[PDB]
What does this fold into?
Amino acid sequence: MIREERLLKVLRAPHVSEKASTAMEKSNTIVLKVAKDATKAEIKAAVQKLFEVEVEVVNTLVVKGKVKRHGQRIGRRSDWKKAYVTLKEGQNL
Amino acid sequence: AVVKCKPTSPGRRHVVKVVNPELHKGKPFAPLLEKNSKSGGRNNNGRITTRHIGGGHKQAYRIVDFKRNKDGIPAVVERLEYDPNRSANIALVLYKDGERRYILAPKGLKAGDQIQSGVDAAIKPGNTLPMRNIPVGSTVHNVEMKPGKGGQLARSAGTYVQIVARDGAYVTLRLRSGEMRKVEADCRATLGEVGNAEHMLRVLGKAGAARWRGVRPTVRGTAMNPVDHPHGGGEGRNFGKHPVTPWGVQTKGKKTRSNKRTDKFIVRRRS
Amino acid sequence: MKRTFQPSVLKRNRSHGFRARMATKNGRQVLARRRAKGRARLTVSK
RNA sequence: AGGACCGAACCGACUAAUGUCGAAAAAUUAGCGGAUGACUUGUGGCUGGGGGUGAAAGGCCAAUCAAACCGGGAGAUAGCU
RNA sequence: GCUCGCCGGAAGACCAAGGGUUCCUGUCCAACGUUAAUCGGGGCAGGGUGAGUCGACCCCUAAGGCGAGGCCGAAAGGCGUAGUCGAUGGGAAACAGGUUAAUAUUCCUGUACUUGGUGUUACUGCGAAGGGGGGACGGAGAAGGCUAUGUUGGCCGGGCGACGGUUGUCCCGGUUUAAGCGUGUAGGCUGGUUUUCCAGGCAAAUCCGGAAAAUCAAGGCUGAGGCGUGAUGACGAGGCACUACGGUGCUGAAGCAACAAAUGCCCUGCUUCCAGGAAAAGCCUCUAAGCAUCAGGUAACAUCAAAUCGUACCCCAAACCGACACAGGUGGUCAGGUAGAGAAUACCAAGGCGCUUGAGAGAACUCGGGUGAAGGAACUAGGCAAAAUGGUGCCGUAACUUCGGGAGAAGGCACGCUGAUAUGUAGGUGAGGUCCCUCGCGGAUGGAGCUGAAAUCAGUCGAAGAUACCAGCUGGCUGCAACUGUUUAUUAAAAACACAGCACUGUGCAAACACGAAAGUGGACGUAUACGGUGUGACGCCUGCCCGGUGCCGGGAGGUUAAU
It folds into this structure.
């Protein structure tokens, strides 16, 4: 019974992109930014309570941030989690 | 088992094949198969102890029931098998119990022979017991040194010992080499010789053989440079020294033996 | 001409790994020597 | 059957020619030897300095080996520049 | 965009390993790029990397490491026992198609399947750090069958030819479909099956082992392939409509037969050979303790899950390695069509590329090439190179000898192409029909067609038909060393090395010895037909003396002399 305490935490963000919209339309699949742990089932229940809707199943992933340099100094973004998250049918917000 | 093969190859010239046309073509008996490691000379530390060692083909194991201590329960051989772990050959027998084991071979040992061990053993070869009850004089082999050590004697191709004397509690025995040694009569041993004695007929002519008989080349010592070996030097093929161990101790003859733990068993040294 | 360096991240580890050094005394006797000098990087496994 | 032959790959380095500030801190061009076996190459692992291993040449050991590298002694010492 | 050139057992595609954002979008040209730059692995920004099934992780070990105890050791600590991890190995199962600029067996469609859990059901002996089995293994050959694959026809659909001809032996393309499932084959192995009993499998066994007795010849097990299902689906030339001149949407015909046949599969097969050829888990049996009413297991149903982590991209390389976008090196997977013995040799296919300065000019001298009159090695240290030869099939072919070889000895023959033989023959293949049988994916049958040498003979062009490439010079005398082998990563490849046997020697196991501060290593899981060391080198003939010296093996009578 994933505790809402950790749960509400887990999610980082919803994301926007062409492919995101494209999954949205062709499949009703939601397109997000979420934590480092962000295990699939975690995400499942998370969005499931957070939109009161009927998740089908998700795809997990790992971004690799770019190692850009910032003036002279070099850096690299800490990585995060998108996910291909869909339902059999749903109303998007 | 002797056949000269025909000199079709420069390099097949002096070969000598050693063919027992009775050796069982096929796979050994699982109940005696055991994993083996190629040491190549190394030690626990890993340093190569014994030299020219290494390579050699994969090579299974056949735990020898040297002890053969099973008494009163008889067995019959079923197959003589070839083992690269020996120069002799191994013979699976079937104890009346049904438990199975290879054994090493007397010469006349063939398929269809029924034996066992024990002090009341028959005197047909292959059986074994201690030489308190083995009659004197008999030519035997496969001999223990201490009671129940298992047997480290005459273990080899066409090996066997003939009794020279039996000393009350004791017995002196003619090693196939020529030293005679007291051994306790309760030390067990197997009657008869060993077959297969023709190994020496093989000449391993191709470099390949010893290669795949697991032999590194061995230097002609002095040929190398002084840099490491006792022998050495020579602005071309010169010794002018003494033959000594590769650590410096004279060879071509030095009495080096000093056990003294057992020398009281050295009745007459080997020549 | 197949020159000196060849790569293996696995072999990096089993070569000079963090666990490697810290498991042996002498290894345990380097981390300071650099921390003494204050290297950014302890070893090469990052 | 063959430590067989001819000869692909593969491994090797015999001859010459560039090339020797070169494209490469050893190449390629013309060739050339082996080409089922002492075959050969990965991946894994083992071996340590007056040590290792070496089908021996004093070889080879992170290009670097008649004693690896690196730290220290130690600013070694220098009837010599 | 056009034309041209180049590769293609790769300069193509896919991977590991490494790379660790470079890929694509958009954007700019400082610098980076060796010229210019509008282009980019270059600057900036955004994006994209989706796994119950593909790896990893995971279960197990493998050679290895570490190491409680301990043993050994100045202290470090050596070492191993229990253990315990450590892939290049083994272990449950996914695919076709579509899908984007950028991924995809993970996304969409459809069809799978596999592994636990959960319960419901009825059946109910299960269960193990342990028993056994299996997993399970070498090399060399050799088929055969199939198949991808490839060829032709049939088919469709397109078309009628830029100049002689070109409505047909016409021309151009296409002529498709997974897993699994059910089939169960060519094939391969296999005696089954029952009862009894037994010092065996560390107890225990009902199992493996064995003994017997019986008792019947069948079953079992394996195993590609092909066939039905798959798959009335999709794909699928093309067509059509729209245009973002880049793709959308719908329709989408035909989509079969035959041939040829793998370095692939049946193959862990078979058959042979000695050099004698991992393990343990996963799996199956078994029972101990224990409980066997419970539990647990059998299975039918139903249900659920099947974490993460990896996942783009690059790769014979501009991204890996060597300081460069590198003429050097880096394994694995695939493997077309043309002649061809052919993974090559040439030249194309899909593909891909045209190597980041260019342009003129045409002396020397180079550097690679080709070309050559007579001469034909006189050149040169040296016939170095170059040249010169080379193939296939046949004839014929020495010295000498370990009888094998040499010996591709040499030397010569001949070779295109068309026709006929014989409008394709030999051969291979096998249609239909005919039957035969326990009915099959059965068999004899017959040869339909089709594929298809080679030879002979005929005829004939050239100068030449091994026409290109590709593709040994050979002789003869010998020194050396028997050679296959090794060798100086980088100036040397042999005679140097090793090597087969041979002898010497040393050594009978807590063996010698080597390392080891000692434990304890390897030897050797061996017991002298064994191993060490040395010397030497196949083989055939042989291998003499000098024991003074110097070492070694022995003998001790006396001189000799420490420590006490």
Notes: Chains C and B do not touch (no CB pair under 8 Å).
